[PDB]
Ligand binder design. Structure first.
Ligand SMILES: CCCCCCCCCCO[C@@H]1O[C@H](CO)[C@@H](O[C@H]2O[C@H](CO)[C@@H](O)[C@H](O)[C@H]2O)[C@H](O)[C@H]1O
Ligand SMILES: CCCCCCCCCCO[C@@H]1O[C@H](CO)[C@@H](O[C@H]2O[C@H](CO)[C@@H](O)[C@H](O)[C@H]2O)[C@H](O)[C@H]1O
Ligand SMILES: CCCCCCCCCCO[C@@H]1O[C@H](CO)[C@@H](O[C@H]2O[C@H](CO)[C@@H](O)[C@H](O)[C@H]2O)[C@H](O)[C@H]1O
Ligand SMILES: [F-]
Ligand SMILES: [F-]
Ligand SMILES: [F-]
Ligand code: NA
Lengths: 125, 96, 124, 96
């Protein structure tokens, strides 16, 4: 699996680079719940939600293109580690209300975007 | 590039041997502020203590009466780029 | 451009580790896929130690800092895979494990960040 | 590569116009099972219905007495590689 390796790297590099640009540009605007790190998780949820519904209806796509979107792009674009340190930093700052809110908005929000992705492509069919 | 240095550093209240200082917080996630203070004259040793990021005030006790003290405040703050790092200080002078 | 290479070199290593770990292990326990958990817990551990270490060594190159955090930990961890696993359990009517997944990933990743931070802090 | 196809598909109970089927679940996150059934002699339309992934049993009603029915079950399941996808079926024949 070397063709598979390139799907992960090409997809992942595009995702990580989008996260890097979005996070450095926007995170500082609202430091209680950094919007760049949120947007990349909500966007990745939206992409993989649509991918969930789409790959079901098109079962004979190449595993290359499937692996490039999910493990590559969505894997690289989203982040749990950045989400953790933001929360951890708020916890050490004594900012529990926003630490809790961050956890809810990221988790609840990402599932909502996955649902919106899934149910838009499902309904458009 | 938002400023992580505090602003509006001033003495709100003062006895002969203590100062109450307050500052406007920077628009970043401050973990703690480090307050340093020492006698402006010469080379008496400068002391520092920390206060939590939730607090935007501090009491400096055990000072000498009628002495010029230099007082600085800097933050230890989270940012996406630098992670935990120390800001540049904001400084004031105050005679007891 | 130097910063861009840190993100790509770090990110590619992280994404590749996630890809190998997830495809190998996730199927062993499908209620709470262990490969996706391990990569998040490991990324939390790495960035926790990174939190404490970069504080005490403030004049390191932003290249090496950016390669570990945005690159490796960014690429290694995943929120999207975490979401679909939970979403799939929610559509399967498996609420108990959907909830458990959310708690174990969130609570666990903070614990590993704390362990990373407090080990390096306690070690001078 | 764990099998997402069910096993041990069988009729546990049967009247002249109904069958109760059960199956051993596959070791994957099944979202729902799709049960299909039709008359084995291949000139009558096959019908399908779904049951939730939590359930490992299903009742097929309104059948004809003394007729050979082909009954298949397949899953719609989450996997890391394929996301949501449909498994291959497991099939049995049963005369009412
Ligand atoms: C729920 C699942 C997650 C589990 C794992 C989370 C681990 C989080 C670590 C918390 O770190 C502590 O946070 C305190 C604040 O919360 C800080 O207190 C500091 O600030 C307080 C006020 O905010 C003061 O009372 C303290 O004296 C002062 O040390 C303290 O330094 C810091 O080490
Ligand atoms: C925060 C946002 C999270 C959004 C999650 C979406 C949930 O998706 C639904 O979950 C139901 C619960 O699993 C499924 O019902 C299924 O399971 C139910 C419980 O067994 C049955 O009553 C239904 O008929 C059956 O369609 C339903 O299909 C599915 O679309
Ligand atoms: C999964 C959990 C792992 C458990 C490991 C064991 C950890 C036990 C708690 C450590 O004790 C804390 O250490 C901090 C130092 O790291 C101190 O913060 C002090 O120093 C900080 C900066 O280092 C400042 O932000 C604080 O305000 C100041 O109170 C804090 O008082 C003290 O209680
Ligand atoms: F993490
Ligand atoms: F966050
Ligand atoms: F996500
Ligand atoms: Na990632």
């Amino acid at each position: 699996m070397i063709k598979s390796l390139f799907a992960v790297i090409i997809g992942g590099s595009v995702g990580c680079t989008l996260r890097w640009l979005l996070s450095t540009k926007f995170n500082s605007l609202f430091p209680n719940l950094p919007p760049g790190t949120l947007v990349v998780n909500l966007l990745a949820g939206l992409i993989i939600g649509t991918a969930l519904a789409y790959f079901l209806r098109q079962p004979h796509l190449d595993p290359f293109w499937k692996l490039m979107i999910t493990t590559g792009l969505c894997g690289g674009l989203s982040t749990f580690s950045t989400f953790s340190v933001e929360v951890f930093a708020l916890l050490q700052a004594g900012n529990y209300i926003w630490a809790l809110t961050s956890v809810l908005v990221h988790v609840i929000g990402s599932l909502i975007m996955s649902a919106l992705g899934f149910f838009i492509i499902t309904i458009l069919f | 590039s938002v400023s992580s240095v505090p602003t509006k550093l001033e003495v709100v209240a003062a006895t002969p041997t203590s100062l109450l200082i307050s500052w406007d917080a920077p628009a970043v996630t401050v973990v703690h502020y480090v307050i340093t203070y020492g006698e402006t004259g010469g080379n008496s040793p400068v002391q520092e203590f920390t206060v939590p990021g939730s607090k935007s005030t501090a009491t400096i006790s055990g000072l000498k009466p009628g002495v010029d003290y230099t007082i600085t405040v800097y933050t230890m703050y989270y940012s996406y780029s630098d992670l935990y790092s120390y800001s540049s200080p904001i400084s004031i002078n105050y005679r007891t």
